[PDB]
Amino acid sequence: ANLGFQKLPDLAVQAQQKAPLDALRKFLETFDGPVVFSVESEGRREALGE
DNA sequence: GGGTATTCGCCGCGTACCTCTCCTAGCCCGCAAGTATCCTATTCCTTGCAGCGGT
């Protein structure tokens, strides 16, 4: 059996540009299903929550 | 047990005299390694503007 499990698109953060979250802010707009971030710690949650 | 045999480690190896040379280690300072910072050039990257082409 095959299970459609494509690799994630190009998402990255870098402070070089004016808008660092450009790949994320465009990927989240053009995705129709859900999306689930997965963090390893609790404080890391806030490090991704802000 | 218990006697024989092989091995091992200590003790020993002349008296008196004469000449010569040579006898230093430990600590303080400045070097190295790592780490951290500031400071000053020096390159690199991003965005905004002047000139040129398409309509």
Side-chain angles (χ1 to χ4, degrees), chain A residues 14-44:
Chain A
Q14 65 276 62
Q16 320 277 27
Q17 278 71 247
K18 264 163 301 193
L21 292 183
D22 189 70
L24 262 174
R25 87 173 67 249
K26 288 188 293 187
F27 173 55
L28 301 185
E29 285 169 22
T30 179
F31 198 101
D32 219 330
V35 64
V36 167
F37 303 88
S38 175
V39 304
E40 70 281 358
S41 177
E42 186 65 68
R44 177 61 71 188

mmCIF file of all heavy atoms in Angstrom, chain A residues 14-44:
data_model
loop_
_atom_site.group_PDB
_atom_site.id
_atom_site.type_symbol
_atom_site.label_atom_id
_atom_site.label_comp_id
_atom_site.label_asym_id
_atom_site.label_seq_id
_atom_site.Cartn_x
_atom_site.Cartn_y
_atom_site.Cartn_z
ATOM 1 N N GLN A 14 14.872 33.321 8.575
ATOM 2 C CA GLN A 14 16.157 33.997 8.504
ATOM 3 C C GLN A 14 15.924 35.490 8.671
ATOM 4 O O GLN A 14 14.973 36.041 8.109
ATOM 5 C CB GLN A 14 16.890 33.686 7.188
ATOM 6 C CG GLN A 14 16.232 34.188 5.913
ATOM 7 C CD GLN A 14 15.161 33.254 5.394
ATOM 8 O OE1 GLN A 14 14.156 33.013 6.058
ATOM 9 N NE2 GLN A 14 15.373 32.720 4.198
ATOM 10 N N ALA A 15 16.781 36.137 9.460
ATOM 11 C CA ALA A 15 16.619 37.556 9.739
ATOM 12 C C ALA A 15 17.167 38.440 8.631
ATOM 13 O O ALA A 15 17.156 39.666 8.781
ATOM 14 C CB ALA A 15 17.294 37.915 11.063
ATOM 15 N N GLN A 16 17.657 37.848 7.540
ATOM 16 C CA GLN A 16 18.280 38.628 6.479
ATOM 17 C C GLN A 16 17.272 39.548 5.799
ATOM 18 O O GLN A 16 17.560 40.722 5.539
ATOM 19 C CB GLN A 16 18.927 37.686 5.465
ATOM 20 C CG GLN A 16 19.642 36.492 6.090
ATOM 21 C CD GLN A 16 21.051 36.805 6.565
ATOM 22 O OE1 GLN A 16 21.377 37.944 6.896
ATOM 23 N NE2 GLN A 16 21.897 35.783 6.598
ATOM 24 N N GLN A 17 16.080 39.035 5.508
ATOM 25 C CA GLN A 17 15.078 39.826 4.814
ATOM 26 C C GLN A 17 14.348 40.745 5.792
ATOM 27 O O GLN A 17 14.533 40.679 7.010
ATOM 28 C CB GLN A 17 14.080 38.919 4.096
ATOM 29 C CG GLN A 17 14.557 38.415 2.748
ATOM 30 C CD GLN A 17 15.662 37.388 2.869
ATOM 31 O OE1 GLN A 17 16.801 37.634 2.474
ATOM 32 N NE2 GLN A 17 15.330 36.228 3.420
ATOM 33 N N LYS A 18 13.514 41.629 5.238
ATOM 34 C CA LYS A 18 12.637 42.431 6.086
ATOM 35 C C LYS A 18 11.609 41.549 6.777
ATOM 36 O O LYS A 18 11.394 41.657 7.989
ATOM 37 C CB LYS A 18 11.929 43.512 5.268
ATOM 38 C CG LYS A 18 12.601 44.874 5.286
ATOM 39 C CD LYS A 18 12.090 45.739 4.142
ATOM 40 C CE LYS A 18 12.340 45.088 2.796
ATOM 41 N NZ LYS A 18 12.132 46.036 1.670
ATOM 42 N N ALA A 19 10.970 40.659 6.017
ATOM 43 C CA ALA A 19 9.975 39.745 6.554
ATOM 44 C C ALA A 19 10.606 38.368 6.680
ATOM 45 O O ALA A 19 10.801 37.685 5.664
ATOM 46 C CB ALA A 19 8.740 39.693 5.653
ATOM 47 N N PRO A 20 10.948 37.917 7.888
ATOM 48 C CA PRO A 20 11.566 36.590 8.009
ATOM 49 C C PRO A 20 10.576 35.461 7.809
ATOM 50 O O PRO A 20 10.925 34.428 7.225
ATOM 51 C CB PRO A 20 12.146 36.597 9.432
ATOM 52 C CG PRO A 20 11.627 37.844 10.102
ATOM 53 C CD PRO A 20 10.664 38.527 9.195
ATOM 54 N N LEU A 21 9.343 35.632 8.273
ATOM 55 C CA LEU A 21 8.334 34.579 8.210
ATOM 56 C C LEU A 21 7.555 34.623 6.904
ATOM 57 O O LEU A 21 6.332 34.502 6.883
ATOM 58 C CB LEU A 21 7.400 34.728 9.397
ATOM 59 C CG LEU A 21 8.047 34.422 10.736
ATOM 60 C CD1 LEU A 21 7.002 34.538 11.789
ATOM 61 C CD2 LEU A 21 8.621 33.036 10.723
ATOM 62 N N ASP A 22 8.270 34.730 5.789
ATOM 63 C CA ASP A 22 7.591 34.894 4.512
ATOM 64 C C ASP A 22 7.143 33.552 3.956
ATOM 65 O O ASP A 22 6.003 33.418 3.491
ATOM 66 C CB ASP A 22 8.511 35.620 3.534
ATOM 67 C CG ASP A 22 7.806 36.026 2.264
ATOM 68 O OD1 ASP A 22 6.961 36.945 2.321
ATOM 69 O OD2 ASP A 22 8.121 35.449 1.204
ATOM 70 N N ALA A 23 8.015 32.545 4.036
ATOM 71 C CA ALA A 23 7.642 31.200 3.613
ATOM 72 C C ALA A 23 6.493 30.664 4.454
ATOM 73 O O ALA A 23 5.543 30.081 3.923
ATOM 74 C CB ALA A 23 8.854 30.273 3.694
ATOM 75 N N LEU A 24 6.551 30.874 5.771
ATOM 76 C CA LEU A 24 5.464 30.437 6.641
ATOM 77 C C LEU A 24 4.181 31.208 6.363
ATOM 78 O O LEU A 24 3.100 30.615 6.268
ATOM 79 C CB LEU A 24 5.863 30.593 8.105
ATOM 80 C CG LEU A 24 6.370 29.339 8.808
ATOM 81 C CD1 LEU A 24 6.865 29.686 10.196
ATOM 82 C CD2 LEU A 24 5.265 28.304 8.878
ATOM 83 N N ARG A 25 4.273 32.536 6.238
ATOM 84 C CA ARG A 25 3.060 33.328 6.077
ATOM 85 C C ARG A 25 2.418 33.105 4.719
ATOM 86 O O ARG A 25 1.229 33.389 4.548
ATOM 87 C CB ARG A 25 3.352 34.814 6.287
ATOM 88 C CG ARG A 25 3.817 35.548 5.043
ATOM 89 C CD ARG A 25 3.926 37.040 5.293
ATOM 90 N NE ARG A 25 4.990 37.357 6.240
ATOM 91 C CZ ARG A 25 4.781 37.825 7.465
ATOM 92 N NH1 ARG A 25 3.544 38.034 7.893
ATOM 93 N NH2 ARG A 25 5.808 38.087 8.261
ATOM 94 N N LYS A 26 3.175 32.597 3.741
ATOM 95 C CA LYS A 26 2.545 32.233 2.478
ATOM 96 C C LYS A 26 2.082 30.783 2.462
ATOM 97 O O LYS A 26 1.080 30.471 1.812
ATOM 98 C CB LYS A 26 3.491 32.486 1.307
ATOM 99 C CG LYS A 26 3.706 33.949 0.987
ATOM 100 C CD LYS A 26 4.493 34.096 -0.298
ATOM 101 C CE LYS A 26 5.909 33.584 -0.137
ATOM 102 N NZ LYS A 26 6.740 33.871 -1.336
ATOM 103 N N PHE A 27 2.782 29.889 3.163
ATOM 104 C CA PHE A 27 2.376 28.490 3.193
ATOM 105 C C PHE A 27 1.079 28.310 3.967
ATOM 106 O O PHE A 27 0.205 27.539 3.557
ATOM 107 C CB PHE A 27 3.485 27.636 3.805
ATOM 108 C CG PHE A 27 3.088 26.208 4.040
ATOM 109 C CD1 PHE A 27 2.587 25.435 3.011
ATOM 110 C CD2 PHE A 27 3.208 25.646 5.295
ATOM 111 C CE1 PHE A 27 2.219 24.128 3.227
ATOM 112 C CE2 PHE A 27 2.842 24.338 5.517
ATOM 113 C CZ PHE A 27 2.347 23.579 4.482
ATOM 114 N N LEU A 28 0.935 29.006 5.094
ATOM 115 C CA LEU A 28 -0.270 28.838 5.897
ATOM 116 C C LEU A 28 -1.504 29.420 5.221
ATOM 117 O O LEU A 28 -2.623 29.008 5.545
ATOM 118 C CB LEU A 28 -0.079 29.464 7.276
ATOM 119 C CG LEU A 28 1.077 28.875 8.083
ATOM 120 C CD1 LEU A 28 1.124 29.465 9.475
ATOM 121 C CD2 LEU A 28 0.976 27.366 8.151
ATOM 122 N N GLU A 29 -1.334 30.360 4.294
ATOM 123 C CA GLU A 29 -2.491 30.939 3.624
ATOM 124 C C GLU A 29 -3.061 30.029 2.544
ATOM 125 O O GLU A 29 -4.278 30.017 2.335
ATOM 126 C CB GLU A 29 -2.128 32.296 3.021
ATOM 127 C CG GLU A 29 -1.995 33.412 4.041
ATOM 128 C CD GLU A 29 -1.376 34.663 3.453
ATOM 129 O OE1 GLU A 29 -1.436 34.830 2.216
ATOM 130 O OE2 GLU A 29 -0.829 35.478 4.224
ATOM 131 N N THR A 30 -2.215 29.262 1.852
ATOM 132 C CA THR A 30 -2.647 28.471 0.706
ATOM 133 C C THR A 30 -2.792 26.991 1.036
ATOM 134 O O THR A 30 -2.725 26.143 0.139
ATOM 135 C CB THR A 30 -1.682 28.655 -0.468
ATOM 136 O OG1 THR A 30 -2.120 27.856 -1.572
ATOM 137 C CG2 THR A 30 -0.272 28.234 -0.081
ATOM 138 N N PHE A 31 -3.006 26.661 2.305
ATOM 139 C CA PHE A 31 -3.211 25.285 2.738
ATOM 140 C C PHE A 31 -4.644 25.170 3.230
ATOM 141 O O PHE A 31 -5.062 25.933 4.106
ATOM 142 C CB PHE A 31 -2.220 24.909 3.840
ATOM 143 C CG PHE A 31 -2.068 23.434 4.044
ATOM 144 C CD1 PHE A 31 -0.983 22.761 3.515
ATOM 145 C CD2 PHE A 31 -2.999 22.720 4.769
ATOM 146 C CE1 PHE A 31 -0.836 21.405 3.701
ATOM 147 C CE2 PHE A 31 -2.855 21.365 4.954
ATOM 148 C CZ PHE A 31 -1.772 20.707 4.422
ATOM 149 N N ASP A 32 -5.393 24.221 2.674
ATOM 150 C CA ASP A 32 -6.809 24.117 2.997
ATOM 151 C C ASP A 32 -7.083 23.218 4.192
ATOM 152 O O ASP A 32 -8.059 23.447 4.916
ATOM 153 C CB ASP A 32 -7.598 23.609 1.790
ATOM 154 C CG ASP A 32 -8.935 24.304 1.639
ATOM 155 O OD1 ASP A 32 -9.513 24.707 2.671
ATOM 156 O OD2 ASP A 32 -9.406 24.451 0.494
ATOM 157 N N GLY A 33 -6.256 22.206 4.420
ATOM 158 C CA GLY A 33 -6.422 21.362 5.574
ATOM 159 C C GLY A 33 -5.828 21.985 6.814
ATOM 160 O O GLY A 33 -5.390 23.140 6.826
ATOM 161 N N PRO A 34 -5.808 21.213 7.892
ATOM 162 C CA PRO A 34 -5.240 21.726 9.142
ATOM 163 C C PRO A 34 -3.729 21.783 9.088
ATOM 164 O O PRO A 34 -3.122 21.385 8.092
ATOM 165 C CB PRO A 34 -5.714 20.711 10.184
ATOM 166 C CG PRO A 34 -5.864 19.458 9.418
ATOM 167 C CD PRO A 34 -6.350 19.856 8.054
ATOM 168 N N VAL A 35 -3.111 22.272 10.155
ATOM 169 C CA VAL A 35 -1.666 22.199 10.295
ATOM 170 C C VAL A 35 -1.354 22.199 11.781
ATOM 171 O O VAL A 35 -2.007 22.885 12.570
ATOM 172 C CB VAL A 35 -0.962 23.344 9.528
ATOM 173 C CG1 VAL A 35 -1.317 24.683 10.096
ATOM 174 C CG2 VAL A 35 0.531 23.151 9.551
ATOM 175 N N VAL A 36 -0.387 21.378 12.165
ATOM 176 C CA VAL A 36 -0.101 21.099 13.559
ATOM 177 C C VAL A 36 1.390 21.295 13.766
ATOM 178 O O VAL A 36 2.206 20.554 13.203
ATOM 179 C CB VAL A 36 -0.531 19.683 13.951
ATOM 180 C CG1 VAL A 36 0.059 19.314 15.268
ATOM 181 C CG2 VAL A 36 -2.039 19.584 14.007
ATOM 182 N N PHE A 37 1.752 22.308 14.539
ATOM 183 C CA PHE A 37 3.134 22.466 14.945
ATOM 184 C C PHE A 37 3.439 21.487 16.067
ATOM 185 O O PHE A 37 2.572 21.140 16.869
ATOM 186 C CB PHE A 37 3.398 23.901 15.392
ATOM 187 C CG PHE A 37 3.082 24.924 14.341
ATOM 188 C CD1 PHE A 37 1.811 25.453 14.231
ATOM 189 C CD2 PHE A 37 4.053 25.345 13.457
ATOM 190 C CE1 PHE A 37 1.516 26.380 13.264
ATOM 191 C CE2 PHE A 37 3.763 26.276 12.489
ATOM 192 C CZ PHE A 37 2.492 26.794 12.392
ATOM 193 N N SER A 38 4.679 21.020 16.105
ATOM 194 C CA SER A 38 5.093 20.013 17.070
ATOM 195 C C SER A 38 6.379 20.474 17.727
ATOM 196 O O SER A 38 7.429 20.511 17.080
ATOM 197 C CB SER A 38 5.290 18.652 16.404
ATOM 198 O OG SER A 38 5.810 17.714 17.327
ATOM 199 N N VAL A 39 6.297 20.813 19.007
ATOM 200 C CA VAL A 39 7.455 21.296 19.742
ATOM 201 C C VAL A 39 7.858 20.236 20.753
ATOM 202 O O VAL A 39 7.063 19.379 21.139
ATOM 203 C CB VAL A 39 7.180 22.645 20.428
ATOM 204 C CG1 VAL A 39 6.713 23.653 19.406
ATOM 205 C CG2 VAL A 39 6.138 22.486 21.501
ATOM 206 N N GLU A 40 9.119 20.284 21.172
ATOM 207 C CA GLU A 40 9.648 19.237 22.036
ATOM 208 C C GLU A 40 9.491 19.544 23.517
ATOM 209 O O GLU A 40 9.323 18.622 24.318
ATOM 210 C CB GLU A 40 11.125 18.967 21.713
ATOM 211 C CG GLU A 40 12.109 20.061 22.104
ATOM 212 C CD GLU A 40 12.142 21.217 21.120
ATOM 213 O OE1 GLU A 40 11.422 21.163 20.102
ATOM 214 O OE2 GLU A 40 12.890 22.186 21.369
ATOM 215 N N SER A 41 9.530 20.808 23.903
ATOM 216 C CA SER A 41 9.461 21.193 25.298
ATOM 217 C C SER A 41 8.183 21.980 25.554
ATOM 218 O O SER A 41 7.321 22.116 24.684
ATOM 219 C CB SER A 41 10.702 21.995 25.678
ATOM 220 O OG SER A 41 10.618 22.440 27.016
ATOM 221 N N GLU A 42 8.050 22.499 26.770
ATOM 222 C CA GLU A 42 6.958 23.408 27.081
ATOM 223 C C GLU A 42 7.332 24.851 26.786
ATOM 224 O O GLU A 42 6.574 25.562 26.117
ATOM 225 C CB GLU A 42 6.555 23.262 28.548
ATOM 226 C CG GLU A 42 5.328 24.056 28.931
ATOM 227 C CD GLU A 42 4.079 23.575 28.233
ATOM 228 O OE1 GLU A 42 3.627 22.450 28.531
ATOM 229 O OE2 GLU A 42 3.546 24.321 27.389
ATOM 230 N N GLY A 43 8.502 25.283 27.254
ATOM 231 C CA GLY A 43 8.944 26.642 26.986
ATOM 232 C C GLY A 43 9.180 26.894 25.513
ATOM 233 O O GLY A 43 8.932 27.996 25.015
ATOM 234 N N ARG A 44 9.650 25.870 24.795
ATOM 235 C CA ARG A 44 9.774 25.957 23.345
ATOM 236 C C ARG A 44 8.439 26.296 22.699
ATOM 237 O O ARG A 44 8.395 27.011 21.690
ATOM 238 C CB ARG A 44 10.330 24.647 22.794
ATOM 239 C CG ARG A 44 10.430 24.596 21.287
ATOM 240 C CD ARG A 44 11.363 25.665 20.755
ATOM 241 N NE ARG A 44 12.760 25.377 21.059
ATOM 242 C CZ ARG A 44 13.757 26.225 20.833
ATOM 243 N NH1 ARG A 44 13.512 27.412 20.301
ATOM 244 N NH2 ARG A 44 15.002 25.883 21.139
#
